């Protein structure tokens, strides 16, 4: 089930990350194309101008949000991965506790609530780190 892992511990929930990632786009295509089986539904619903516009705004936004998250992972050098490890050290200010307490016997919902406003700091750090890595690769490849 799509949110079935919500009550699982962080290190257990992480076993099934793929299903949440898939639902974000697969649900859109199936709901708009495969669910809309009766041709008379679209013909009639196109007469409701306001519903037509509202539903498009919802689809377009879902796409825009999907892409924004993917662009961000790309910038950080996590493209194509569900699990990405990077070279930004963890600061105890964000969370000071054992990695046993954090990964296991605690859920992701609880975790997100605890990190809270530290998220913006982390994102800025991740972006700078990747830029330094790209420059270093470009220079090494010029040395032969």
């Amino acid at each position: 089930g799509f949110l079935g892992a919500a009550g699982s511990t962080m290190g257990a929930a992480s076993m099934t990350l793929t299903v949440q990632a898939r639902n974000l786009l697969s649900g859109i295509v199936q709901q708009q194309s495969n669910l809309l089986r009766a041709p008379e539904c679209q013909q009639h619903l196109l007469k409701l101008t306001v519903w037509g516009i509202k539903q498009l705004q919802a689809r377009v936004l879902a796409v825009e949000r999907y892409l924004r998250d993917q662009q961000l992972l790309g910038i950080w050098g996590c493209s194509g991965k569900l699990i990405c490890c990077t070279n930004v050290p963890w600061n105890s200010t964000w969370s000071n506790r054992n990695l046993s307490e954090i990964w296991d016997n605690m859920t992701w919902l609880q975790w997100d609530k605890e990190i809270s406003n530290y998220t913006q700091i982390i994102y800025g750090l991740l972006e700078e780190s990747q830029n330094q890595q790209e420059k270093n690769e470009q220079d090494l490849l010029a040395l032969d």
Binding site: G1, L35, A62, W90, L109
Partner: protein
């Protein structure tokens, strides 16, 4: 020691959010009734076997009084209603002076003066010709000018649109479905009061079907409580709030309009028809509703018990009938069989705690959403109408203002359609899924 920031995508977490929900119905269930406004505009089918995912050890906060699902349902119902009536005949040619007399033929004393026989000069297809026609109007729709000259009640205030004669407004279950990226959380706690944390939370794709029943004072054909009567309000102490009461066992109510009407079709312009009320076959008798007395008495006893828990064990609770105001809020309203019954509920709320026949009236020109400027004329329904419905809940107000709260008085209220919705959507909340998260790990790149 030496843990690094890692990024996980597909993390199963969420936040409160407001989005557009799609309207879906069980397609087989419309059974070809494509003239039902609710089916034709909620065409998209639901999935067979809607799934529910219980979320073990997930606690979530619900608040039925700030739930935007209600506001969205309200707005969409009004919108569909207006679109349904858009492509139909206007009755502006009907706003003429009427010459009326009393209907006195085989009529009971109970309706003397209730119906009027009005004749008038109305147009035909050719502009040049006029025709003399007549129709029987209910008194509530006709107003005296300055004792034989009358006009339809809305000639000064608004245009009147005749409802489309083939369109049904019969409620069908409607399911609200989240768009991808969103999920609906359902609270299944028993004895849930509408605002606290919910212990048993599950995830669903769509809500259960809700019938968009329109009524005042009493709520018909809704959900029942499973344990006992549940009383919910935004603020109990504040007498300005409505109190919504959900019953655990339904009370059956049997309503009828005994008069056998024949409908008369009148041409009013090129391709335009007006539906008149014709004449009545047989005796003229009052419309009425029957509520089992013993069942109603037991029902109040349960409601009172729960009110005592909040208002005190030695507090006297009195029920009384509604205050004055617009007919649409002082009486009960059915919208059943295609006729708009306005019923007098004083017989249900006349007791002090410490079969019942309710007379009804019919009104053809109405303003359902409390708006002014858009009036609908209901075409007559032929033959005899009988409806049997389930009373599933009540909307009550408390007078307040008493000295030292010695006793309390409750009266039927409501009238704001949002509360009819809140009575069904209190178990659902919409959340946005936010898949990108960060956590420490024993790794380095």
């Amino acid at each position: 020691e030496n843990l690094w920031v890692t990024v996980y995508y597909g993390v199963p977490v969420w936040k409160d959010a407001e989005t557009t929900l799609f309207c879906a119905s069980d397609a087989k269930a419309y059974e070809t009734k494509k003239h039902n406004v609710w089916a034709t505009h909620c065409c998209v089918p639901t999935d067979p076997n809607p799934q529910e995912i219980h979320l073990e050890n997930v606690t979530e906060e619900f608040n039925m009084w700030k739930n935007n699902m209600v506001e969205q349902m309200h707005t969409d119902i009004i919108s569909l209603w207006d679109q349904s009536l858009k492509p139909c005949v206007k009755l502006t040619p009907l706003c003429v002076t009427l010459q009326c007399t009393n209907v006195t033929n085989n009529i009971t004393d109970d309706m003397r003066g209730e119906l009027k026989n009005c004749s008038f000069n109305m147009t035909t297809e050719l502009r040049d010709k006029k025709q003399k026609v007549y129709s029987l109007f209910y008194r509530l729709d006709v107003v005296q000018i300055n004792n034989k000259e009358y006009r339809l009640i809305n000639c000064n205030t608004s245009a009147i649109t005749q409802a489309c004669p083939k369109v049904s407004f019969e409620p069908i279950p409607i399911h609200y479905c989240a768009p991808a990226g969103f999920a609906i959380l359902k609270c299944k706690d028993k004895k849930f009061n509408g605002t606290g944390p919910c212990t048993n939370v599950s995830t669903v794709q769509c809500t259960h079907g809700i019938k968009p029943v329109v009524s005042t004072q009493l709520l018909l054909n809704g959900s029942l409580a499973e344990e006992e009567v549940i009383i919910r309000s935004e603020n109990i102490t504040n007498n300005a709030k409505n109190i919504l009461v959900q019953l655990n066992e339904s009370v059956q109510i049997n309503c009828t309009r005994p008069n056998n009407n024949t409908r008369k079709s009148i041409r009013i312009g090129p391709g335009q028809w007006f539906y008149a009320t014709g004449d009545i076959i047989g005796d003229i008798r009052q419309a009425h509703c029957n509520v089992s007395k013993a069942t109603w008495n037991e029902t109040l006893g349960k409601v009172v018990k729960q009110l005592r828990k909040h208002f005190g064990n030695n507090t006297i609770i009195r029920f009384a009938n509604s205050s004055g105001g617009d007919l649409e809020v002082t009486t009960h309203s059915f919208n059943c069989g295609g006729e708009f019954f306005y019923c007098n509920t004083s017989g249900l709320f006349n007791s002090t705690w410490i079969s019942i026949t309710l007379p009804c009236r019919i009104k053809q020109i109405i303003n359902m959403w409390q708006r002014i400027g858009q009036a609908m004329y209901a075409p007559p329904i032929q033959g005899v109408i009988r409806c049997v419905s389930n009373i599933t809940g009540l909307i009550l107000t408390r007078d307040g203002g008493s000295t030292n709260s010695t006793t309390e008085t409750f009266r039927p209220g409501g009238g704001d359609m949002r509360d009819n919705w809140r009575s069904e959507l209190y178990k659902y909340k919409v959340v946005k899924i936010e898949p990108l998260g960060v956590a420490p790990t024993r790794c380095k790149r």
